[PDB]
Amino acid sequence: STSQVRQNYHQDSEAAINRQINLELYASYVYLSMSYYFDRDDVALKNFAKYFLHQSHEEREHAEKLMKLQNQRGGRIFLQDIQKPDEDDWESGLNAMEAALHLEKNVNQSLLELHKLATDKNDPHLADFIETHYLNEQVKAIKELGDHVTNLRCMGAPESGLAEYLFDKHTLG
Amino acid sequence: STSQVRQNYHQDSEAAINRQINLELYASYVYLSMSYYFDRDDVALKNFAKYFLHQSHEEREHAEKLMKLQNQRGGRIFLQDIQKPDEDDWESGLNAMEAALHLEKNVNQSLLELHKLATDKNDPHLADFIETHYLNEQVKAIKELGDHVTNLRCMGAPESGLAEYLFDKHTLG
Amino acid sequence: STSQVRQNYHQDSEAAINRQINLELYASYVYLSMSYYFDRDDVALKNFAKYFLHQSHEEREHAEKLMKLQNQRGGRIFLQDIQKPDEDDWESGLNAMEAALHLEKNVNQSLLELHKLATDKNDPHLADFIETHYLNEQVKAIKELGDHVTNLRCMGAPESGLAEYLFDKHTLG
Amino acid sequence: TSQVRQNYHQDSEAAINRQINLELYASYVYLSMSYYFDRDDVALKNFAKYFLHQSHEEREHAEKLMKLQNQRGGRIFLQDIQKPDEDDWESGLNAMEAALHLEKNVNQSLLELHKLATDKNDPHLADFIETHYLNEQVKAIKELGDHVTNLRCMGAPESGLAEYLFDKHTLG
Amino acid sequence: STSQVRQNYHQDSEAAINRQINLELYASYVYLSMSYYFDRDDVALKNFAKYFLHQSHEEREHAEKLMKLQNQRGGRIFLQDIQKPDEDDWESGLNAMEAALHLEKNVNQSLLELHKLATDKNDPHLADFIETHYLNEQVKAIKELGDHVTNLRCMGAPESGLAEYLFDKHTLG
Amino acid sequence: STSQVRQNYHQDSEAAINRQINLELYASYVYLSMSYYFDRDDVALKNFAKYFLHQSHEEREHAEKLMKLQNQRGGRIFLQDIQKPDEDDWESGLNAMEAALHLEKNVNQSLLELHKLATDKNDPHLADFIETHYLNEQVKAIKELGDHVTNLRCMGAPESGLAEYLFDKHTLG
Ligand SMILES: [Ca+2]
Ligand SMILES: [Ca+2]
Ligand SMILES: [Ca+2]
Ligand SMILES: [Ca+2]
Ligand SMILES: [Ca+2]
Ligand SMILES: [Ca+2]
Ligand SMILES: [Ca+2]
Ligand SMILES: [Ca+2]
Ligand SMILES: [Ca+2]
Ligand SMILES: [Ca+2]
Ligand SMILES: [Ca+2]
Ligand SMILES: [Ca+2]
Ligand SMILES: [Fe+3]
Ligand SMILES: [Fe+3]
Ligand SMILES: [Fe+3]
Ligand SMILES: [Fe+3]
Ligand SMILES: [Fe+3]
Ligand SMILES: [Fe+3]
Ligand SMILES: [Fe+3]
Ligand SMILES: [Fe+3]
Ligand SMILES: [Fe+3]
Ligand SMILES: [Fe+3]
Ligand SMILES: [Fe+3]
Ligand SMILES: [Fe+3]
Ligand SMILES: [Fe+3]
Ligand SMILES: [Fe+3]
Ligand SMILES: [Fe+3]
């Protein structure tokens, strides 16, 4: 049928929102895996672990906000499998930060594609939602992950375990 | 290799814990889907939605506790895909409660199998963990879902939309 | 007809839980008898009376908790007559403490048989309920009753009314 | 005989022991009703709470009667507490009706006790019954009649919505 | 003999409890020796010293709790010499942490044997006591000590005295 | 050897300090044994038990203070076995107090020998340490234990169990 509330909401937008919901859930899963990688007795960097757990919970929050948006505009939510991450072992704190930066840039690219779709379908409410609740957050996350990678490399990671210990204490602690 | 902390932790227990982690994540996903089903403009039962969102967040919490346990005993976490739920449309509040009761009983059965495995491998710490943090919680959840189903049927749901409206207000609100 | 919530709960366990409910109600009745025995004008030991009244209300709470457990697991409560205590006159403070020690040890033996039955039926939830709420409380109750009996004997009870008076004041006061 | 006994007939002592057993019986009945409404296939929480409160109240009444027996120098003799007549209380309305009938029976026993007290010229016992039991019983009977009337008027027990709404709005 | 409170308490259990009392006292002695080793003017790692002193006092508390248990169940405490630790010089913070992990795992193995004994003698109160107050505490202590050993090796200890200095400041501080 | 902080600290003094450390640990063990003797269900004098447990912990504190002293002066701690007490059964409160007075006087004799040693080696810091933290404490403890023995004998202990009961309530309580 058609929703009593639906207005100026193109089916391509609805579909892209379902895709973005799955993507946010996937990012949440990736962050959860990294978090509990740093909780291992043979890794044992508890501030890395908590930083990535916080990222996980925020990604789940963004997915729930996209679901709420979908219901707000009168589209229908269709969920798909959440794929396991591409690694079970994240090697080191610097490698985890680099993978997280890569993930965030890929999510940002998919968000930019969704904003271009909203613009092409003349959906100003969807474009504004994407701008206010996602684009700047993505820019901030990417700047922060770049900062962390820069510091970890400059400190001598991943060769120097002292570097990751001290960065876990003084930046992430 | 072998963990410096591992002691009396059988590989079958480690594997069953990885399976249980996936199962808890799956239950979290099921509850999230039901929650946002009741947020639809054509369903619009906001206390059903929030009840199931709370269940979702608690299931994710239990999954994270199982991951922490796995790392505590010196096993290694291996994550798998989180399968999408078996339905996208949950029909009604009573049907959602019935499906949730079914889900909870299946999870309880898998937890009882894990406790029998801990007992058969003479792992008293694992059995006690399962007892203190899971079994009674499962019994309580199942009793509560049975209560809710009983009330919703006695009120005349799902034929009576007034019944689900008033139950959403007075029990779940 | 099978309850919608029943899972891994044996007929024998349900029957034994009904039996234990009746046993706890009986213990509450026995302690109530003892309490108001020490309230008599020709005994007049107010702190013995209060001690046994407190025990009686505690036993009632235990009975109600077992009734709650029975309903949680999907069993059906069936109550029986609460038999009157074996005495109307409890003779002395020392004799009442000794009778309470005997009663508590018999209730403990019943609980141990109940835990054995839960274990033989592979019911970890029921066994953990027993351990958590009853076993240690019984052990401490028995230890305290033994302490009281020892002190009363050492002081010269029951031949010395001065001893029972001073014990009622300084230990139970 | 007790050093405190004065103007306390044997028949009064026996009637008080009977009343102690009766109050304990009512406490048992209310406990059974309470946990009937805690079953997963009934699941009316405020009915359960209400009847549990009544059960504890009747236990308090029994203990007060035992205290009176000791105060007047009589001797307490306990008997078996008979199990309630039902294990399954059918519905909220049926349970309220059974509670009304039970309270009326208990009130009749208390009135016989009071008449016995005045027959034996025991003004202290008659006043004890008046002060602590008669008005409490009349108020309980009135409240239970109110509950029955409202449940019937709402469509109980045929309407499950009626019992659910009464449980929420009156007993909650 | 035979205590007035004794019930379902096997003589093998009483003996094993006496052994475990001595074991906990010995661990408290080992920890006290480590603590004051790090108090030496030629070692002078004050947070290492405090950490091991705290562990010493907690092991003393576990011993006293086992003695309370023994009296509770009606067994009779029989004490034995507390053997001096196997070393006087503990070499370094990393070596002390490694020795502590070894000791904790040996104590855990003995606790697991005691739990197996309790289970084999159908003593659910003793088994539950062991599960409640010792098993999870020992798993947590082993995980923490493993974490510390991992971090110290990672920072370059013991070849790097700066590593132990910084670990004492930032993790044990 | 020879510490960087060592000054005016004779090897005989270092050895005597190690002996005194072991002596204080032994007294702490004797007091712990007395304490839990009075915790038995067939003794059950709870304030006697608390009194002796407090003494146990204070003797442990004296031992730790001597170890701190040893490290302060540049000596090296060498620990020895803590011998089990000479009894397992302490008979009565009066007999325990008498044994405690005997032990305290023996410890005081050793402390006086240590002070004579410090004086003979012209070590005013060690002599002043002994005077400040041990001599008056030992005189006070001996006076108190003598007071308690006098009062217990006076009340008719040990032939009067009422005497020990009342002394536990009114003096140790
Ligand atoms: Ca896949
Ligand atoms: Ca792959
Ligand atoms: Ca790969
Ligand atoms: Ca815009
Ligand atoms: Ca799939
Ligand atoms: Ca499907
Ligand atoms: Ca389907
Ligand atoms: Ca267990
Ligand atoms: Ca009047
Ligand atoms: Ca009047
Ligand atoms: Ca347990
Ligand atoms: Ca001086
Ligand atoms: Fe995101
Ligand atoms: Fe992001
Ligand atoms: Fe769960
Ligand atoms: Fe659950
Ligand atoms: Fe009980
Ligand atoms: Fe009890
Ligand atoms: Fe009444
Ligand atoms: Fe009444
Ligand atoms: Fe309403
Ligand atoms: Fe320990
Ligand atoms: Fe330990
Ligand atoms: Fe420990
Ligand atoms: Fe001392
Ligand atoms: Fe001393
Ligand atoms: Fe002293």
Coordinates of C-alpha atoms and ligand atoms in Angstrom, one line a residue, chain B residues 128 131, chain C residues 128 131, chain E residues 128 131, ligand 11:
Chain B
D128 CA 28.3 -21.0 38.3
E131 CA 23.7 -19.9 36.9
Chain C
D128 CA 21.0 -22.7 42.2
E131 CA 21.8 -23.0 47.1
Chain E
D128 CA 28.3 -23.3 46.5
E131 CA 31.8 -21.1 43.8
Ligands
CA11 CA 25.8 -21.6 42.5

